[PDB]
Amino acid sequence: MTLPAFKAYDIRGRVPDELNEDLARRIGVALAAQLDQGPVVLGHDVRLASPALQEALSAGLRASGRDVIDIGLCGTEEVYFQTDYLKAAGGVMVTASHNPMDYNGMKLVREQARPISSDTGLFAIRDTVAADTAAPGEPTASEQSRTDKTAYLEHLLSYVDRSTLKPLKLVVNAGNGGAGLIVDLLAPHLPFEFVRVFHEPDGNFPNGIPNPLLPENRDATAKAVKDNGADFGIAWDGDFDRCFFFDHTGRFIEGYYLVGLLAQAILAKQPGGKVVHDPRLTWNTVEQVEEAGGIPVLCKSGHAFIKEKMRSENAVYGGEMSAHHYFREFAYADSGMIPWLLIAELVSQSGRSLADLVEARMQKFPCSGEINFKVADAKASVARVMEHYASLSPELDYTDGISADFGQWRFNLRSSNTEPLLRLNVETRGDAALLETRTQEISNLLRG
Numbered sequence: 001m002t003l004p005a006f007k008a009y010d011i012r013g014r015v016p017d018e019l020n021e022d023l024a025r026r027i028g029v030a031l032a033a034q035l036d037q038g039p040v041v042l043g044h045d046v047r048l049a050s051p052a053l054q055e056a057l058s059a060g061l062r063a064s065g066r067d068v069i070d071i072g073l074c075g076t077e078e079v080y081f082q083t084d085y086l087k088a089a090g091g092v093m094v095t096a097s098h099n100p101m102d103y104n105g106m107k108l109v110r111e112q113a114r115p116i117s118s119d120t121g122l123f124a125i126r127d128t129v130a131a132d133t134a135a136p137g138e139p140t141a142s143e144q145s146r147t148d149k150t151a152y153l154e155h156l157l158s159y160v161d162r163s164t165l166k167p168l169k170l171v172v173n174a175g176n177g178g179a180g181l182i183v184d185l186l187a188p189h190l191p192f193e194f195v196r197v198f199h200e201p202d203g204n205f206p207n208g209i210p211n212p213l214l215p216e217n218r219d220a221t222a223k224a225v226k227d228n229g230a231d232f233g234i235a236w237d238g239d240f241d242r243c244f245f246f247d248h249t250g251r252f253i254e255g256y257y258l259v260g261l262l263a264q265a266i267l268a269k270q271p272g273g274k275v276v277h278d279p280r281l282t283w284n285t286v287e288q289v290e291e292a293g294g295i296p297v298l299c300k301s302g303h304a305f306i307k308e309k310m311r312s313e314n315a316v317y318g319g320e321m322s323a324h325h326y327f328r329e330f331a332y333a334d335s336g337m338i339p340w341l342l343i344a345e346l347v348s349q350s351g352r353s354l355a356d357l358v359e360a361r362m363q364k365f366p367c368s369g370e371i372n373f374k375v376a377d378a379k380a381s382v383a384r385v386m387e388h389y390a391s392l393s394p395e396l397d398y399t400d401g402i403s404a405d406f407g408q409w410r411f412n413l414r415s416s417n418t419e420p421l422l423r424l425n426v427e428t429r430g431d432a433a434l435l436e437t438r439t440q441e442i443s444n445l446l447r448g
């Protein structure tokens with residue numbers, strides 16, 4: 001009935017039955033009709049099928065009279081950056097994120113790298129592609145190759161004071177995705193000693209598809225940090241718009257705590273700024289932002305909502321617990337590079353370990369981590385939870401699912417916009433025992 005590849009925030013599907021060169025050319029034609037005037041920026045990740053999908057995208061765009069700026073093999077944040085930097089009408093990143101090997105996809109943005117989502121253009125594109133039986137026209141526009149990263153690289157380096165940086169030893173783990181190319185281009189401008197793990201891009205993924213959240217991939221970075229006495233370690237997903245931190249003990253840092261740490265880091269530079277955060281886990285961020293002089297701003301989870309709220313608020317920084325970090329100067333877009341530059345600067349400047357920068361906060365606001373439930377009836381399961389806790393009279397907020405605040409503990413429970421899942425997050429005021437008993441209680445009710 002509808003094309004499955006078109007999801008709430010991007011396109012993704014198995015090649016070639018859900019996504020192929022014909023659909024990609026048709027997407028290019030339909031994208032040309034949705035955008036304002038200007039050229040379109042295209043880039044792609046390390047997957048084997050990605051270049052051919054970009055070529056068809058370009059073929060459909062140029063047949064519709066759009067100039068194409070091919071920035072080549074890149075990270076997703078480079079499409080965002082170059083789209084805004086070159087004042088393009090739009091951009092497309094061909095990337096499969098971390099879906100299986102036979103999969104690929106696309107992330108589409110319009111002017112200033114504003115996201116194009118299901119309800120803001122993507123389903124309009126889908127419907128056009130679905131009905132398009134027109135003969136493929138011929139290109140009436142040019143393609144320029146623009147692989148110079150100087151402006152991008154300079155913008156990354158502008159977030160830190162290079163004269164304050166220490167020669168930290170940093171484990172870097174590209175997972176054979178694309179992040180290692182950017183690390184190597186930054187390295188002549190930085191004092192750090194890099195320990196490079198799974199560094200070379202390989203779309204065949206000899207060491208697994210890049211996903212630092214899976215414990216086996218987690219351990220490769222952790223062991224490299226411990227084995228080398230590194231100050232900390234960093235891992236990326238394949239298109240490296242997500243980054244993941246490992247302290248000097250090898251412990252993976254739960255992304256929740258990076259939001260408050262990056263907020264204080266940014267607020268030191270831009271006093272009194274607003275900081276956008278999501279509703280899943282809040283107490284630590286609210287406190288760290290306020291203590292650093294900032295103003296926290298609650299916002300629905302999801303990069304489209306985060307970006308739009310950041311724009312309306314002139315917020316300097318936005319952070320999600322799911323390893324997405326957004327920066328006003330970066331076209332309000334997410335970066336997998338800016339966050340570790342900022343953390344390295346903080347470690348260099350404060351003389352404190354990454355471990356110690358987060359340890360007191362992890363003690364003060366222990367959290368469950370996101371816990372996903374595939375249930376027979378999401379709506380019924382949520383009702384069993386709320387009915388159980390009704391007699392306690394929690395403070396309820398519906399910005400994003402249901403947030404219930406009981407005083408010493410709170411939870412958020414939502415349905416995913418990208419998967420038919422229920423997602424659960426719990427945190428407490430310095431009480432690990434209460435965190436475990438309440439998490440287990442909620443889990444049993446959801447599973448019921």
Ligand SMILES: O=P(O)(O)O[C@H]1O[C@H](CF)[C@@H](O)[C@H](O)[C@H]1O
Nearest residue numbers: 301302303320322416417418419
């Ligand atoms: O939880 P979801 O499935 O609805 O959304 C997930 O993908 C979004 C886009 F990448 C993120 O912005 C959310 O923070 C993340 O949680």
Ligand SMILES: [Mg+2]
Nearest residue numbers: 237239241242
């Ligand atoms: Mg990614």
